[PDB]
Design a protein around this ligand. Structure first.
Ligand code: EI9
Length: 182
């Protein structure tokens, strides 16, 4: 009866990355791999071991990307893509940041975007003095059906009401100008 002793595999292997602003180093040299995991049990062991995003120093990021996709725009799977952006005010660091980030992680490892989960590359949380940000990165900013389905599902999974609109920008523009809004 394998259910007793086998870990539950995830559809993908995922890499969790950490960034801290150290002005002595280049941006790339500051982007650091925490660990990779590919089971439910190993995801929770990692998550239960690390700091909540709300406890990070301003200027730090977490990011979760599929194994083989670097957490930067210049990766082959990111360079033609873009992101759904959640912007948090300073009060939402207390109320929403950690629960929104956990839900984002689960949307990813749980493959919650049906046939379009293959367009997801990863997700990033930025802790910043002027307002935190959470974003889901996807591979192709011209795939309207993929991008808007991901945005509608994501908005629903976060519990955001229709009074809130979220935008999708291509990375080529980021490097707010929206391609899509939901
Ligand atoms: S926010 O904090 O104001 C902000 C502004 C600009 C970019 C970003 S970012 O795209 O989320 N970003 C941080 C990051 C951290 C860890 N993993 C991925 C992304 C970021 C910053 C600088 C970059 C330089 C070059 N290529 C990139 O893809 C970069 C991404 C947040």
């Amino acid at each position: 009866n394998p259910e007793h002793y086998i870990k539950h595999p995830l559809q993908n292997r995922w890499a969790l990355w950490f960034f801290k602003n150290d002005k002595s180093k280049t941006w790339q040299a500051n982007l650091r791999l925490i660990s990779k995991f590919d089971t439910v049990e190993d995801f929770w062991a990692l998550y239960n071991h690390i700091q909540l995003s709300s406890n990070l120093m301003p200027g730090c990021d977490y990011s979760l990307f599929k194994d083989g996709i670097e957490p930067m725009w210049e990766d082959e799977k990111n360079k033609r893509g873009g992101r759904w952006l959640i912007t948090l005010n300073k009060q939402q660091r207390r109320s929403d940041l950690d629960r929104f980030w956990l839900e984002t992680l689960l949307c990813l490892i749980g493959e919650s975007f049906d046939d379009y989960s293959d367009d997801v590359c990863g997700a990033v949380v930025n802790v910043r003095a002027k307002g935190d940000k959470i974003a889901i990165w996807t591979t192709e900013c011209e795939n309207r059906d993929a991008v808007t389905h991901i945005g509608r599902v994501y908005k629903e999974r976060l519990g955001l009401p229709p009074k809130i609109v979220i935008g999708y920008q291509s990375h080529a523009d980021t490097a707010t100008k929206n391609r899509f809004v939901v």
